[PDB]
């Protein structure tokens, strides 16, 4: 019998507040130099021996547009960078034919002056930032010069331009549209916020990256959003639609995240929203997650101490919410409606608290709890251990009109139920 959760205040996460976030007074230095001189690029590309695909895209030794030692905007880049590498094809509309690296001391901005920054698929363009970067009231899209359109998704391994930020960086995106980014390659999922690989991290010690993404739209992305060892990142007021694998997908010891008031739908292969592998102490609230190929919302691989609250979770093709091996979480007052399978499913998770959830008209159970032996499976039990136990407490809310019944919990360690409505 606890009190309603205290959810983080979202009032200060606005475009106006984001504009006031970078230092524009000290102009920066613009260089077109070699990719493989830079840690920001080697870190995910690999050694000199991995440079060939880039040599092919660029038809020469691989280069990048590099920003450092101060502030640079897109309009600045256009003037100082050769037209072959960054062209204005119509007013406000640019095509980058090289990648852009914001170095550690760089500060990079795109604003409403830019109608569209097109990143060339053929030429191998992408955006990496180790510094400060702000993108507002504009469009950054993965662009196919061959098709003269968006680099629309076709196959997992086909390169598409992406955005990636490294440890010690800070990023703010607001009122921006991005489409067709990312593919099945490390750090290249689409929009990725990431700490350095552990080897590079024990050296640089740059500390975890952070930032906001607000009131923006992301479409046809491999992952709408991805992060790795990321702190207090904010994702609010966005639309993630028709993305490929995942809508919003925090990973790997990220924490303090705020994922709120997003509308996530139409995910083609998997989940609307997933936090996987020790994504702890985060907040998932007031989102709509619907019509996704698998679950509406997933907590995976020992992702603990989270609050999932007041989300509208409906018409997903499997579960509303699935908890996989992720104990000690609170689900408060979610409305989980008309998902094809279960409303809320809990596998191998203990101390799950279900308070005031409405689970209605799902195809199977309203709430389904079970255990499963994961030893003879593809699971790396060293990296991701598990315990075949399930336990939960349910208080209030309502379970009704579900296809297979209100609840089923098989072989529970313990289940307590208090004043849950289950209508006949």
From Swiss-Prot:
It is an enzyme of class 5 (isomerase). The C-terminal region contains a right-handed beta-helix (RHbetaH) fold, which is common among proteins that bind and cleave long-chain linear polysaccharides. Changing residue 226 to F: Retains 66% of epimerase activity. GO terms for cellular component: periplasmic space. GO terms for biological process: alginic acid biosynthetic process. Changing residue 252 to A: Loss of epimerase activity. It comes from Pseudomonas syringae pv. tomato (strain ATCC BAA-871 / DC3000). One of its GO terms (molecular function) is isomerase activity. PbH1 repeats lie at residues 230-252, 254-277, 279-301, 303-325, 326-348. Changing residue 228 to A: Retains 66% of epimerase activity. It comes from the Bacteria. Changing residue 277 to E: Loss of epimerase activity. Pathway: Glycan biosynthesis; alginate biosynthesis. Keywords: Alginate biosynthesis, Isomerase, Periplasm, Repeat, Signal. Changing residue 301 to A: Retains 23% of epimerase activity. It catalyses: [(1->4)-beta-D-mannuronosyl](n) = [alginate](n). The chain holds residues 69 to 492 of 536 of the full protein. Its EC number is 5.1.3.37. The gene is algG. It is found in: Periplasm. The active site is at 251 (proton acceptor). Changing residue 277 to A/Q: Retains 10% of epimerase activity. Belongs to the D-mannuronate C5-epimerase family. This is Mannuronan C5-epimerase. Catalyzes the epimerization of beta-D-mannuronate to alpha-L-guluronate during the synthesis of the linear polysaccharide alginate. In addition, is part of a periplasmic protein complex that protects alginate from degradation by AlgL by channeling the newly formed alginate polymer through a scaffold that transfers the alginate polymer through the periplasmic space to the outer membrane secretin AlgE. Its main location: periplasm. Changing residue 347 to C: Loss of epimerase activity. Changing residue 300 to N: Retains 5% of epimerase activity.
